[PDB]
């Protein structure tokens, strides 16, 4: 009846799930009923959170699709607004507003989900701090944080990903510096293992972009600040930097290993994407830039390989042009290439974990969902392996 009693009960510890299910079910009633080749499916944007807020990463939800982390950077235009913003959006729901919002304190970078955790969302920050986000929680607040230990990541984190089965799964963030840190998926105040990627010259290698070959090897490709793509075992006698793959003219902006068996045998390959303006194909056992790709005008930032087709991938540019690429057909041109309105110099490309659709992490603001349906895995196992053999032979000059 009185304002005191209302602001009691509103700010009491009862209306939390009430407001949550209120917003959730009213947004659930937003889908209108009626009573009478690149998709360009749907743009995902919000001015309350994204305007001069470039994307930082993107990753689909392994478990429960139609959920992808829209991690961003926060411009200091409104410094009062939380630095670092990570959101999720939806496809099966079909609305305009994002699914969630998460205030942060530092520019969120490389935020993803947590495997074997249907509600835990980790995220690297520009402060070097690593946060966590929870669906069973009831805020925008990081549920946990990490200290700034002498061995922890003081430098900004650029690639945080869960590693391991559910009986033993770790989480590894990596600063720019080169230290990698193992984490516990329940507590967060203490580094489990915090070693450092060291090289004989320039010990603290300025890393970026980790990725893992599916099969959870303790080896992970690491994109250096200038080519020098080192990949390294996590321990053994090769705790730090172990092998050197180089011959790239610039800053590595994106990396990704091979996806699962589309048709062909696993094909232990990975790729780069750099400021050299060309994507280069690389295998795990060569110390050779195996096969370079097209010299698209401007930079090439991210790259992701389709989990379905064992030979098709995508990338972005400074022009806002998804220049996807299969390789069973082409050898020097993109297979399908579409653009975006204007020329937003894009920053993320994401094949969906579910396969046969793709999220383009648009740079300034929005997130545009794309899709394809004519690119599948016909049993071109050795036909693709043949193509790999054609590369392995034609590059020999």
């Amino acid at each position: 009846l009185t304002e005191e009693e209302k602001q009691q009960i509103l700010h009491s510890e009862e209306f939390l799930s009430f407001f949550d299910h209120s917003t959730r079910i009213v947004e659930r009633a937003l889908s209108e009923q009626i009573n009478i080749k690149l998709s360009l499916n749907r743009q995902f944007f919000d001015e309350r959170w994204s305007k001069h807020r470039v994307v930082s990463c993107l990753d689909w939800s392994s478990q429960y699709p139609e959920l992808l982390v829209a991690s961003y950077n926060n411009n200091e235009d409104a410094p009062h607004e939380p630095d670092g913003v990570a959101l999720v959006w939806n496809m099966k729901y079909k609305k305009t507003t994002p699914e969630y919002v998460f205030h942060c304190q530092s520019a969120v970078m490389s935020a993803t989900f947590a495997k074997f955790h249907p509600n835990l969302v980790v995220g690297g920050t520009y402060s070097g701090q690593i946060v966590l986000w929870d669906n069973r929680s009831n805020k925008r607040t990081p549920v946990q944080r990490t200290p700034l230990s002498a061995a922890a990541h003081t430098h900004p984190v650029y690639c945080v990903n869960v590693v391991g089965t559910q009986n033993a799964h770790n989480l590894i963030s990596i600063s720019t510096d080169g230290k990698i840190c193992s984490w516990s998926l329940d507590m967060l105040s203490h580094p489990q293992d915090s070693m450092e990627l060291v090289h004989k010259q320039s010990k603290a290698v300025a890393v970026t972009s980790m990725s893992f070959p599916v099969g959870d090897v303790n080896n992970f490709v690491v994109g250096s600040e200038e080519g020098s793509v080192y990949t390294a075992c996590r321990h053994g006698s090769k705790a730090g930097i172990s092998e050197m793959f180089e011959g790239h003219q610039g800053p590595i902006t994106g990396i990704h290993c091979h996806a699962a068996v589309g048709a062909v045998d696993f094909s232990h390959l990975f790729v780069t994407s750099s400021f050299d303006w060309t994507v280069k194909l690389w295998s795990t056992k060569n110390n050779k830039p195996l096969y370079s790709f097209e010299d698209n005008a401007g930079y090439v930032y991210d790259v992701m390989w389709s989990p379905t087709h064992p030979a098709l991938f995508a990338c972005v540019d400074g022009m806002g042009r998804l220049d996807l690429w299969n390789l069973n057909n082409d050898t020097e041109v993109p297979t399908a290439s579409i653009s975006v309105e204007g020329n937003p110099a894009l920053n993320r490309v994401r094949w969906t974990h579910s396969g046969r659709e793709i999220a383009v992490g648009d740079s300034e603001g929005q997130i545009v969902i794309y899709d394809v349906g004519e690119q599948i895995a016909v049993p071109r196992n050795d036909e693709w392996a043949r193509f790999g053999r054609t590369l392995a032979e034609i590059n020999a000059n």
Binding site: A168, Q192, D193, N218, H235, G236, A239
Partner: protein, 66 residues
């Protein structure tokens, strides 16, 4: 073997700390003297006075610590 050590840290931390807490419990167990313990009183009830019962208490802590 180093591979197993790089993956052994997982168990090793918790297991070593668990045995550490067990040894800490043994510490706190022997910090108090024997007559101020109730084991002395009920041993005294079972005709094990504070001298010939204290040996059972000390050897008991020895068994658990070993």
């Amino acid at each position: 073997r180093p591979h197993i050590r790089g993956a052994i840290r997982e168990y090793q931390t918790q297991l070593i700390q668990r045995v550490k807490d067990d040894i800490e419990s043994l510490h706190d167990k022997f910090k108090v003297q024997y007559p101020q313990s109730q084991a002395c009183k009920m041993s005294h009830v079972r005709d094990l006075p504070p001298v010939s019962g204290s040996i059972i208490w000390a050897k008991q802590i020895d068994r658990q610590l070993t």
